[PDB]
Design a protein around this motif. Structure first.
Motif, PDB file in Angstrom:
ATOM      1  N   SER A 125       0.858  -1.244   0.096  1.00  0.00           N
ATOM      2  CA  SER A 125       0.123  -0.190  -0.106  1.00  0.00           C
ATOM      3  C   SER A 125       0.921   1.195  -0.035  1.00  0.00           C
ATOM      4  CB  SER A 125      -0.934  -0.066   1.213  1.00  0.00           C
ATOM      5  OG  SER A 125      -1.793   1.025   1.355  1.00  0.00           O
ATOM      6  N   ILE A 156       3.105   4.598   0.187  1.00  0.00           N
ATOM      7  CA  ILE A 156       4.406   4.709  -0.327  1.00  0.00           C
ATOM      8  C   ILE A 156       5.148   3.601  -0.830  1.00  0.00           C
ATOM      9  CG2 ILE A 156       6.801   5.640   0.558  1.00  0.00           C
ATOM     10  CD1 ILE A 156       4.577   7.568   2.464  1.00  0.00           C
ATOM     11  N   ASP A 199       5.301  -7.456   3.253  1.00  0.00           N
ATOM     12  CA  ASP A 199       4.025  -6.706   3.597  1.00  0.00           C
ATOM     13  C   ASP A 199       3.357  -7.971   4.441  1.00  0.00           C
ATOM     14  OD1 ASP A 199       1.453  -5.246   4.247  1.00  0.00           O
ATOM     15  OD2 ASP A 199       2.602  -3.706   2.832  1.00  0.00           O
ATOM     16  N   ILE A 200       2.373  -7.585   5.458  1.00  0.00           N
ATOM     17  CA  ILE A 200       1.574  -8.472   5.975  1.00  0.00           C
ATOM     18  C   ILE A 200       0.399  -8.894   5.174  1.00  0.00           C
ATOM     19  CG2 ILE A 200       0.297  -7.011   7.263  1.00  0.00           C
ATOM     20  CD1 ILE A 200       0.221  -8.734   9.872  1.00  0.00           C
ATOM     21  N   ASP A 216       4.623 -10.941   9.003  1.00  0.00           N
ATOM     22  CA  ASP A 216       4.179  -9.851  10.111  1.00  0.00           C
ATOM     23  C   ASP A 216       5.579  -9.447  10.755  1.00  0.00           C
ATOM     24  OD1 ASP A 216       3.687  -8.379  12.365  1.00  0.00           O
ATOM     25  OD2 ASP A 216       2.167  -9.956  13.031  1.00  0.00           O
ATOM     26  N   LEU A 217       5.853  -8.079  10.335  1.00  0.00           N
ATOM     27  CA  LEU A 217       7.028  -7.492  10.586  1.00  0.00           C
ATOM     28  C   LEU A 217       7.313  -7.254  12.305  1.00  0.00           C
ATOM     29  CD1 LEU A 217       7.787  -5.189   7.547  1.00  0.00           C
ATOM     30  CD2 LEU A 217       9.000  -7.380   8.130  1.00  0.00           C
ATOM     31  N   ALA A 220       9.544   1.208   4.894  1.00  0.00           N
ATOM     32  CA  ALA A 220       8.277   2.149   4.749  1.00  0.00           C
ATOM     33  C   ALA A 220       6.882   1.349   5.526  1.00  0.00           C
ATOM     34  CB  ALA A 220       7.849   2.127   3.210  1.00  0.00           C
ATOM     35  N   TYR A 277       3.010   6.404  18.225  1.00  0.00           N
ATOM     36  CA  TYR A 277       3.232   6.879  16.978  1.00  0.00           C
ATOM     37  C   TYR A 277       4.625   7.876  17.097  1.00  0.00           C
ATOM     38  CZ  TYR A 277       3.186   8.240  12.104  1.00  0.00           C
ATOM     39  OH  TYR A 277       3.345   8.359  10.680  1.00  0.00           O
ATOM     40  N   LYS A 325       8.504   7.390  15.805  1.00  0.00           N
ATOM     41  CA  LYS A 325       8.991   8.031  14.731  1.00  0.00           C
ATOM     42  C   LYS A 325      10.217   8.809  15.189  1.00  0.00           C
ATOM     43  CE  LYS A 325       6.560   6.693  11.422  1.00  0.00           C
ATOM     44  NZ  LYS A 325       7.055   5.730  10.397  1.00  0.00           N
ATOM     45  N   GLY A 378       5.080  14.533   5.696  1.00  0.00           N
ATOM     46  CA  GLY A 378       3.802  15.489   6.120  1.00  0.00           C
ATOM     47  C   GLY A 378       2.620  14.788   5.796  1.00  0.00           C
ATOM     48  N   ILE A 393       0.563  12.858   3.290  1.00  0.00           N
ATOM     49  CA  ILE A 393       0.621  12.382   2.164  1.00  0.00           C
ATOM     50  C   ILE A 393      -0.444  11.536   1.907  1.00  0.00           C
ATOM     51  CG2 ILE A 393       1.982  10.878   0.678  1.00  0.00           C
ATOM     52  CD1 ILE A 393       3.565  13.393   1.688  1.00  0.00           C
ATOM     53  N   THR A 419      -2.540   8.690   0.774  1.00  0.00           N
ATOM     54  CA  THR A 419      -2.469   7.296   0.681  1.00  0.00           C
ATOM     55  C   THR A 419      -3.532   6.468   1.216  1.00  0.00           C
ATOM     56  OG1 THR A 419      -1.374   6.627   2.835  1.00  0.00           O
ATOM     57  CG2 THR A 419       0.214   7.393   1.107  1.00  0.00           C
TER      58      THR A 419
HETATM   59  N1  LIG Z   1       0.452   8.717   4.506  1.00  0.00           N
HETATM   60  C1  LIG Z   1       1.254   9.771   5.383  1.00  0.00           C
HETATM   61  O1  LIG Z   1       0.751  10.827   5.354  1.00  0.00           O
HETATM   62  C2  LIG Z   1       2.201   9.596   6.075  1.00  0.00           C
HETATM   63  C3  LIG Z   1       2.658  10.481   6.990  1.00  0.00           C
HETATM   64  C4  LIG Z   1       3.737  10.535   7.828  1.00  0.00           C
HETATM   65  C5  LIG Z   1       4.349   9.106   7.663  1.00  0.00           C
HETATM   66  N2  LIG Z   1       4.002   8.228   7.011  1.00  0.00           N
HETATM   67  C6  LIG Z   1       4.954   6.848   6.841  1.00  0.00           C
HETATM   68  O2  LIG Z   1       5.214   6.438   5.866  1.00  0.00           O
HETATM   69  C7  LIG Z   1       5.226   4.882   5.902  1.00  0.00           C
HETATM   70  C8  LIG Z   1       3.966   4.306   5.190  1.00  0.00           C
HETATM   71  O3  LIG Z   1       2.907   4.911   5.151  1.00  0.00           O
HETATM   72  P1  LIG Z   1       1.715   4.855   3.956  1.00  0.00           P
HETATM   73  O4  LIG Z   1       1.056   5.800   3.949  1.00  0.00           O
HETATM   74  O5  LIG Z   1       2.275   4.038   2.775  1.00  0.00           O
HETATM   75  O6  LIG Z   1       0.848   3.839   4.954  1.00  0.00           O
HETATM   76  P2  LIG Z   1      -0.247   2.410   4.260  1.00  0.00           P
HETATM   77  O7  LIG Z   1      -0.840   2.013   5.470  1.00  0.00           O
HETATM   78  O8  LIG Z   1      -0.692   2.962   2.876  1.00  0.00           O
HETATM   79  O9  LIG Z   1       0.958   1.536   3.882  1.00  0.00           O
HETATM   80  C9  LIG Z   1       2.006   0.870   4.864  1.00  0.00           C
HETATM   81  C10 LIG Z   1       2.015  -0.564   4.569  1.00  0.00           C
HETATM   82  O10 LIG Z   1       2.937  -1.160   5.769  1.00  0.00           O
HETATM   83  C11 LIG Z   1       2.355  -2.279   6.167  1.00  0.00           C
HETATM   84  N3  LIG Z   1       2.554  -3.028   7.361  1.00  0.00           N
HETATM   85  C12 LIG Z   1       2.075  -2.223   8.464  1.00  0.00           C
HETATM   86  N4  LIG Z   1       2.273  -3.276   9.472  1.00  0.00           N
HETATM   87  C13 LIG Z   1       2.854  -4.224   9.229  1.00  0.00           C
HETATM   88  C14 LIG Z   1       3.545  -5.392   9.810  1.00  0.00           C
HETATM   89  N5  LIG Z   1       3.287  -5.810  11.119  1.00  0.00           N
HETATM   90  N6  LIG Z   1       4.170  -6.302   8.802  1.00  0.00           N
HETATM   91  C15 LIG Z   1       4.216  -5.998   7.407  1.00  0.00           C
HETATM   92  N7  LIG Z   1       3.653  -5.001   6.902  1.00  0.00           N
HETATM   93  C16 LIG Z   1       2.974  -4.010   7.443  1.00  0.00           C
HETATM   94  C17 LIG Z   1       0.746  -2.221   5.955  1.00  0.00           C
HETATM   95  O11 LIG Z   1       0.137  -3.705   5.744  1.00  0.00           O
HETATM   96  C18 LIG Z   1       0.892  -1.291   4.427  1.00  0.00           C
HETATM   97  O12 LIG Z   1       0.743  -2.258   3.253  1.00  0.00           O
HETATM   98  C19 LIG Z   1       4.851   4.626   7.324  1.00  0.00           C
HETATM   99  O13 LIG Z   1       6.133   4.461   8.042  1.00  0.00           O
HETATM  100  C20 LIG Z   1       4.022   5.750   7.793  1.00  0.00           C
HETATM  101  O14 LIG Z   1       4.163   5.920   9.318  1.00  0.00           O
HETATM  102  C21 LIG Z   1       3.074   8.224   6.095  1.00  0.00           C
END
Ligand SMILES: NC(=O)c1ccc[n+]([C@@H]2O[C@H](COP(=O)([O-])OP(=O)(O)OC[C@H]3O[C@@H](n4cnc5c(N)ncnc54)[C@H](O)[C@@H]3O)[C@@H](O)[C@H]2O)c1
Ligand SMILES: NC(=O)c1ccc[n+]([C@@H]2O[C@H](COP(=O)([O-])OP(=O)(O)OC[C@H]3O[C@@H](n4cnc5c(N)ncnc54)[C@H](O)[C@@H]3O)[C@@H](O)[C@H]2O)c1
Ligand SMILES: NC(=O)c1ccc[n+]([C@@H]2O[C@H](COP(=O)([O-])OP(=O)(O)OC[C@H]3O[C@@H](n4cnc5c(N)ncnc54)[C@H](O)[C@@H]3O)[C@@H](O)[C@H]2O)c1
Lengths: 227, 227, 227, 243
Positions: free
Chosen positions: D11, D13, D32-33, D54-55, D81, D147, D151, D178, D180, D182
């Protein structure tokens, strides 16, 4: 009489808080996994890396109707190990003591403050390794960075209930050739002592600190100012 | 008795230092461009954006043997102007008062402390704007960031001579609808007051601050914790 | 084609931008006090410490219709002098070049951008001394901390007009036994080069940086990571 | 061709990285999980290896490395990510949930980083790690204790491991996004009031997109980033500049 709960009470900074606050008439709840270096003083033997043990501590405090007005999170462990030799369990264990315990201790005291309308306050003992890294301290650095963040977040979370939450970041503190290295990384040619951190705790829990929350007070002889 | 020089003495944080430290038996040199709101107290009417008047003031103090043991740089101005209407002179003047004056005052007191082997200390009054920006504050923000940097740099410069240099970063302090926007940016539902800054100055020049140098103490009701 | 104005163009980082961006079909306005190391290039001999010369520069550009779309503030001086030997004039000159000229130049291109509805961008070349202090550099440190703050403020100021303002903080860049002290202070065993800074500039002024404003990009071989 | 291991690949990023780097001819290891959004890709002959994991489970990460070593897959680049984010008052944040956020957001990046670095140090390879932190690694917010802590922690970890492996030419950096758009934040974008609040807290009147982060990853893993280690690149539309 204010009640103050102090983790890491058996040694170093936490230990130097015990005598000092008992002498100022605080009631003290001392937490540590050892008790050999330990007045209205309750001593609890507890491995703070075990969240179940924390939870049993709090059941026992609620049964005795004893709840602290102030929490000092001064328990800490510091691995001394190259990162490639830092095991998954050692990393987790450092994070459990340095971050998870302060989180859990803080959420539990804050719950009780909010329900009773008490204006509690929390002091987290972080480190200069919460702001600058060092070799061989992946878990220590990560956990101390985390605790600074946690301090800022919980300040925001509980500020409307007048619960203050702040951190102290000690530099090199003398407790339980190298010296040349310490001096060339500091601005002052002196060692920090526990009492330097105790006086800052004392200020941060005082009435004079009413407008102070979310702040990190660095007490490091200049370590973090530059290179 | 200790002599403490305090700029911005006519108003707000600097003014609240005057009486407080007179009552603790300090001899006080008060500096300000105004004196309408102003015992061993010497009052100097001086425009600190004029570096030659600063130079003269130090010649006078050397002839009177009145060179300070402690310096508090609390004079300050803040523009309230959109950056497109911020003239070159407006920008320069804010820089001259908020950074250049603290630099010159500091270098001069430190010169004398290195000659006479005195363990002096400086406290610079920066701002949360030294950490986080805001609209319509280009010069104020730039100068306060600069003053935090200067504090670090002078702490390093003079640390071997046991001269400590620290900064305090106030939030919204009540000095000489909007109330709701302040509460919105703070964790605490209260107003900072001059005395919150005076108690921190007092702690930072005390013996209990012997290990504190280069540090920035934030006193802001949680403002800088986050959003 | 896009027009890019680059200060400090006769040496180091600014010079390395000149050829590179000419080769990418940018029209380039080069600003420096010297011109010996200096196609749609306009060279201007100009002492950026002189604020009226900056005003005259813009008077000339408005007649030639040559208003830049992109501003790179790469002019810089650093003193090498103990603080007690750092004169008032020398502190102010470092401030006037390192901070005040970026301010004036930025305000003037932003004024033209807001009138013409153009999506300008600015890149300020700060330094790791904008984050961490070092000895014998009071002015350089103060000024580079200031410039980081100015970048944050002007990003906020002009964000709604889609004008982006960012900064780059270089560590040790090789330009116009000590080699071992540099290695001990960095994580990587290599020297930074001007091209490391130029590539970051190119990313920061591209369409790929659409969401990047107010940010400070550190390019330093690990210098600011810790000790 | 380079091998790039990307967590959070199903999913957001991480998915946008999978697609972007496959298109530039990288061999991709996707972690990914969940895998619903990777099944179509697994059915092609693209050089994509998908591992369901499951990370939060360290033993499962160890089994990942057993599998990689048996398949002769040592990545050149690690993109951490995968991440999770609670939305809950702190008093309702349980011990297990605080730890689960820490496990995913910190512990997993640490373990994956130690393991890749171990293999790079043995083979004398010049590796590259990019940790996806957050503006919450710099500024806190309400209802985000785990969180924010995690971070902050990951930024620190980034600096530490940069210093640890720098003599081996292993670069370690972080990106702090910031807002994003998604799947994790898609909630926010149908809510007109919350859009206003985001715009009010940013300097730019836009949102980030996954490609703003992918572009920064591409820069940080390029030859042009040879001198960049320990750094944190904020990509936040001015969120963190002030208030
Ligand atoms: N979208 C935003 O605004 C935003 C903002 C700040 C930081 N981030 C950071 O960017 C990174 C990715 O965010 P995103 O928006 O793509 O989120 P998202 O939820 O769309 O993608 C995260 C992915 O990580 C996977 N994941 C979560 N727990 C897991 C586990 N135990 N094992 C394996 N996979 C796992 C999810 O299943 C998912 O597919 C994260 O670290 C998030 O904290 C995102
Ligand atoms: C820095 O400064 C602070 C104080 O440390 P110091 O300089 O006083 O060093 P120190 O080692 O002398 O003090 C740390 C104390 O924390 C305690 N502690 C460690 N693990 C524990 C556990 N699992 N359960 C309960 N207690 C535990 C230790 O037993 C010790 O008494 C720490 O937070 C440290 O990281
Ligand atoms: C914050 O906190 C500190 C104190 O602020 P406050 O709340 O007391 O504000 P305030 O405005 O009440 O006090 C500022 C003082 O600085 C003085 N000052 C301004 N320009 C001066 C000059 N050119 N020469 C001499 N004195 C001058 C003012 O006259 C005033 O008395 C400052 O550093 C400020 O930026």
């Amino acid at each position: 009489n204010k009640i103050i709960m102090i983790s890491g009470a058996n040694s170093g900074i936490g230990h130097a808080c015990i005598k000092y606050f008992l002498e100022k008439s605080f009631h003290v709840i001392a937490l540590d996994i050892n008790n050999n270096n330990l007045m209205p003083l309750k001593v609890v033997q507890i491995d703070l890396s075990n969240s179940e043990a924390i939870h049993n501590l709090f059941t026992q405090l609620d049964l005795e109707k004893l709840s602290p007005d102030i929490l000092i999170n001064a328990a800490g462990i510091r691995e001394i190990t190259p990162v490639l030799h830092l095991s998954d369990d050692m990393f987790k264990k450092v994070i459990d003591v340095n971050l998870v315990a302060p989180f859990i201790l803080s959420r539990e005291v804050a719950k009780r403050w909010c329900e009773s309308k008490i204006k509690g306050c929390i002091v987290n003992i972080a480190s200069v390794s919460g702001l600058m890294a060092e070799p061989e301290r992946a878990a220590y650095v990560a956990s101390k960075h985390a605790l600074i963040g946690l301090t800022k977040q919980m300040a925001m979370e509980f500020g409307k209930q007048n619960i203050r939450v702040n951190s102290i970041s000690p530099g090199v503190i003398r407790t339980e050739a190298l010296m040349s290295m310490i001096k060339s990384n500091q601005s002052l040619d002196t060692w920090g002592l526990p009492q330097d951190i105790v006086s800052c705790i004392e200020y941060l829990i005082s009435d004079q600190a009413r407008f102070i929350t979310g702040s990190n007070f660095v007490i490091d002889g200049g370590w973090t100012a530059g290179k």
